[PDB]
Design an enzyme around this catalytic site. Structure first.
Site, PDB file in Angstrom:
ATOM      1  N   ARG B 115       0.826  -1.195   0.000  1.00  0.00           N
ATOM      2  CA  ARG B 115       0.000   0.000   0.000  1.00  0.00           C
ATOM      3  C   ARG B 115       0.867   1.256   0.000  1.00  0.00           C
ATOM      4  NH1 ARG B 115      -5.236   1.568   1.072  1.00  0.00           N
ATOM      5  NH2 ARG B 115      -5.929  -0.507   1.778  1.00  0.00           N
ATOM      6  N   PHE B 129      -8.905   0.798  -3.757  1.00  0.00           N
ATOM      7  CA  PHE B 129      -9.171  -0.066  -2.613  1.00  0.00           C
ATOM      8  C   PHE B 129      -9.927   0.671  -1.513  1.00  0.00           C
ATOM      9  CE2 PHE B 129      -6.670  -3.803  -3.686  1.00  0.00           C
ATOM     10  CZ  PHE B 129      -5.790  -3.316  -4.635  1.00  0.00           C
ATOM     11  N   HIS B 130     -10.696  -0.075  -0.730  1.00  0.00           N
ATOM     12  CA  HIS B 130     -11.156   0.413   0.567  1.00  0.00           C
ATOM     13  C   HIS B 130      -9.914   0.690   1.420  1.00  0.00           C
ATOM     14  CE1 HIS B 130     -13.073   0.292   4.596  1.00  0.00           C
ATOM     15  NE2 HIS B 130     -14.132   0.738   3.945  1.00  0.00           N
ATOM     16  N   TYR B 131     -10.021   1.544   2.433  1.00  0.00           N
ATOM     17  CA  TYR B 131      -8.820   1.919   3.178  1.00  0.00           C
ATOM     18  C   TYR B 131      -8.294   0.784   4.075  1.00  0.00           C
ATOM     19  CZ  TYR B 131     -12.093   2.866   7.052  1.00  0.00           C
ATOM     20  OH  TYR B 131     -13.058   2.762   8.026  1.00  0.00           O
ATOM     21  N   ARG B 132      -9.123  -0.219   4.344  1.00  0.00           N
ATOM     22  CA  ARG B 132      -8.719  -1.335   5.202  1.00  0.00           C
ATOM     23  C   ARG B 132      -7.841  -2.363   4.481  1.00  0.00           C
ATOM     24  NH1 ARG B 132     -14.755  -1.467   7.631  1.00  0.00           N
ATOM     25  NH2 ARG B 132     -14.434   0.004   9.365  1.00  0.00           N
TER      26      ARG B 132
END
Ligand SMILES: [Ca+2]
Ligand SMILES: [Ca+2]
Ligand SMILES: [Ca+2]
Ligand SMILES: [Ca+2]
Ligand SMILES: [Ca+2]
Lengths: 177, 182
Positions: B115, B129-132
């Protein structure tokens, strides 16, 4: 019985915003557990001083969150630099865990590690390069065991909640045989 | 379980880099795989090598030089005409057919590392992407401490696509031996 090589460092930070490149750390807290999540010691909860220009330039969400918790006032009154809080935290950690032994433990740990790398690199380097992020388990649990989820930003209470969340998964989600 | 949709799928990703420095090193390989929420592989994405000048390749340390030489990645990088932007766009094009934006956590091994490189060098892809994160290495850390006797059952290559396949196989292994599915 645990040793300097078999313990876990749990950590949480509060920041002025979500930008890992530009925002500041305003609060740090740590907890030491053994590999079986028994709390051995709680580390210092430290507020890092920031000038008013930085506090007044926070977005509305962060102003509401950190104001209501009393963090903003503690930050105003604090005389600690990031370096001061880094050194105090390190002094505590060295009494409980050897360097590069523990993964960084908590919730949404990648965010924490990125802020630490930029603002407290020596502390960041005290951790093993691995992360132990409870929110990974939650992502799996939401998908594979949605029915157990109903059973589930203050730095020290945040860590306790994370530890407690993982104990919940250990009981209901993991085969411990 | 219900059938998978654009809102109930997982994006698995891996990068190969010129080194471990998230501030200074470059991406030289990217791969992706799409699974449903139950790890059924729906589609494998494009495997792309990103070009780097010789000066950057020469500066790599011994481990990276050894690994990427032996695997054939360095030569692929030299011959490649793709920029990081090219590779980013081809990946995004693949992803949009399978998964809606900001739906999937970033899935794989050592995901925080990936990331961070993506944030600096492919931010548009990072933002898809989702932040998770869903980092299989978190499960491995737990398994090492709570179920040490199962670790020997974990099974080659150092290429991005093989790395993703392995992380998916690894999680499937945990699902069978480490998780309560009933
Ligand atoms: Ca955190
Ligand atoms: Ca936090
Ligand atoms: Ca990789
Ligand atoms: Ca499959
Ligand atoms: Ca990876």
């Amino acid at each position: 019985s645990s040793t300097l090589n078999t313990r876990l460092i749990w950590i949480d930070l509060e920041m002025t915003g979500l930008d890992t490149d530009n925002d500041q750390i305003i609060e740090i807290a740590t907890i030491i557990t053994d590999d079986h999540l028994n709390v051995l010691a709680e580390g210092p909860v430290l507020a890092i001083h920031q000038p008013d220009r930085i506090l007044n330039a926070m977005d509305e969400w962060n102003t509401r969150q950190h104001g209501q918790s009393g963090l903003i006032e503690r930050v105003r009154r604090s005389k600690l630099t990031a370096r001061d809080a880094e050194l105090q935290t390190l002094e505590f950690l060295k009494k409980w865990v050897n360097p590069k032994v523990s993964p960084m433990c908590g919730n949404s740990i990648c965010q924490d590690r990125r802020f630490l790398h930029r603002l407290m690199p020596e502390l960041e380097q005290y951790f093993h390069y691995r992360n132990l992020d409870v929110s990974t388990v939650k992502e799996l649990s939401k998908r594979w065991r949605p029915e157990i989820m109903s059973g589930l930003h203050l730095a020290m209470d945040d860590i306790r909640d994370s530890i407690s969340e993982l104990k919940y998964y250990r009981e209901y989600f993991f085969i411990m045989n």
